[PDB]
Amino acid sequence: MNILVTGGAGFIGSHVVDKLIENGYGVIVVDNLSSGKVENLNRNALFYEQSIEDEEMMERIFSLHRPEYVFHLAAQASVAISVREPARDAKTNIIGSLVLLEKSIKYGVKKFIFSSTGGAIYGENVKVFPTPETEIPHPISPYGIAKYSTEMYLEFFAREYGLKYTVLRYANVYGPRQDPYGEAGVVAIFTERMLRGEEVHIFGDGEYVRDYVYVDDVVRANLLAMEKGDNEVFNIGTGRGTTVNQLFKLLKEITGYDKEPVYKPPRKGDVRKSILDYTKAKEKLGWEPKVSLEEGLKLTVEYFRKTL
Amino acid sequence: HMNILVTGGAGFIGSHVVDKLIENGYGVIVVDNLSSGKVENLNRNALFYEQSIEDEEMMERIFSLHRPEYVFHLAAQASVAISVREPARDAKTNIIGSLVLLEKSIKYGVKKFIFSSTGGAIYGENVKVFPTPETEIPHPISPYGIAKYSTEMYLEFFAREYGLKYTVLRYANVYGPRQDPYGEAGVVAIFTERMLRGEEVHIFGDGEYVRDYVYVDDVVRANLLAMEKGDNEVFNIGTGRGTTVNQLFKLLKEITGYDKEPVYKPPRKGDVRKSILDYTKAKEKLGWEPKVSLEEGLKLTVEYFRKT
């Protein structure tokens, strides 16, 4: 069986590719290497260094390989970049998604599994925590708006053509191979600086709460979504909130760092609190996180140590 | 003379907005790629660039040179049927194009951005409350509706991020002189042209689809009122009265003196059953209400088509 993974040279995408290759699937990867890395690529997967926005190239790839599943992880996934360049962000995040969906219909993809966001989608005025999928989205960043837009388009393709889909709204994803710019980029920033004995900056009062989910658990959610959760949106998170101050403290103890953080003015657009309810994924996908924040951070620190 | 930019100014509604601004003494720049607009609609007193709103380099030149104080953004792919067949192309004009304009608007100090949106394609297919207020949760089912709603969310981002003031005008079914047969009230032009030529007229399904028909001159007045009032607000612009396709046929038959019965065709996929907009908020905050009754507006429309 052929499977297409977009964004497969990236952080989460390369872990998804590895797992699929392990399980014996034929994997085709499309990635333009804008933020992904050649070193992340699996030598067993077929690789096209192309952009998902390129209609003629996507036409070619789908026509040759007719993937039965598409795991769509390719995105401009830095919130700050989306703010500085909203049109460019949307070209990748919305238009690129639409190109893939148009080809998916034309070439009979069975199911499309979309990586979306929980933290950037619910908005800044949520009252229910941990937050369920029944809360109406109110995204405030171009990245979150783009992701929500694409979720609506997915429902259109399902209604119009019968395409099956699953949307996975990840919480803050961290672990080996992550760069410092994604939704949990702070894990990498803190880890690399602490291991190098450099100064660490915290924005505002550090009391911003996030839901940190380990990459291996996110990968498992993707694979469970192959045969379960048709035409459903799922939060993928831990339901446990951690402040930046708490995260700093945990990484400090693990790394042996012995300096205090330096507090800086708050950044624009920083949502105060994000914690996801994964009850739905538990009930319908059979998914629960297996890796505690303590264990995940130790595995992450170990990866960065080896890099040094 | 204050400079104003009107995108889509060669189109149906946009050309009337241009005429009114010129009549009121403004300097008007028009950007239109004539994909659905017509040179014969263009006001010769406006400065016309035959360009695409998605063209970042060209929009940079236009905004840099003219520094418009207001932008009336009417350029769109506005056929629902085309959006269903070509969602990626629709989104490039509707979302990416809007984002290019907004990026330039922020850079060059635009004071207010007035956006043409849609009531009918935004509220979706399961509305229970009529006439429908802006508090109704959007559930768009066509790519056009999704794109419009996405752009509304982006407008809120630019306002929060940079202090750009905006107004969103969600039109009902707009009809009148210069309309083509493809827009949301395309039926009026279709019925009128065919009745004047004594040709067969087709009614889809049972003809019981209800729409809220608003005359173009009234829509133009809402655009002008939004220059000084309604900062950062979304407004339905409609009449609050519903008309079936069968009743529209009867009215136009009477006016044109058409002497035949309609021919019924199968129902269209995705035709929402009923759309009627509550304009109370616009009445209160913009001071807007329709001045042209449906009977009066249809007569004026028939007059235009006769001459033409």
Ligand SMILES: NC(=O)c1ccc[n+]([C@@H]2O[C@H](COP(=O)([O-])OP(=O)(O)OC[C@H]3O[C@@H](n4cnc5c(N)ncnc54)[C@H](O)[C@@H]3O)[C@@H](O)[C@H]2O)c1
């Ligand atoms: N990291 C998180 O915390 C987090 C949270 C919520 C959602 N997500 C989502 O998960 C997915 C993966 O995120 P990530 O953290 O691994 O980021 P990533 O940057 O490492 O992965 C994205 C990959 O997509 C590629 N890419 C970007 N634009 C492309 C284009 N036009 N054509 C082809 N390839 C393109 C990049 O090169 C990159 O390899 C994304 O959809 C992202 O939005 C991530």
Ligand SMILES: NC(=O)c1ccc[n+]([C@@H]2O[C@H](COP(=O)([O-])OP(=O)(O)OC[C@H]3O[C@@H](n4cnc5c(N)ncnc54)[C@H](O)[C@@H]3O)[C@@H](O)[C@H]2O)c1
């Ligand atoms: N019943 C209606 O007509 C109705 C209802 C609700 C909303 N609206 C909205 O009102 C606006 C005007 O609609 P209209 O009925 O006058 O349609 P229209 O097609 O006559 O006007 C649109 C204009 O935009 C131009 N255009 C399209 N793509 C462009 C691009 N990439 N760059 C520059 N110009 C481009 C077209 O050439 C055209 O002249 C649209 O935003 C539409 O969505 C219309």
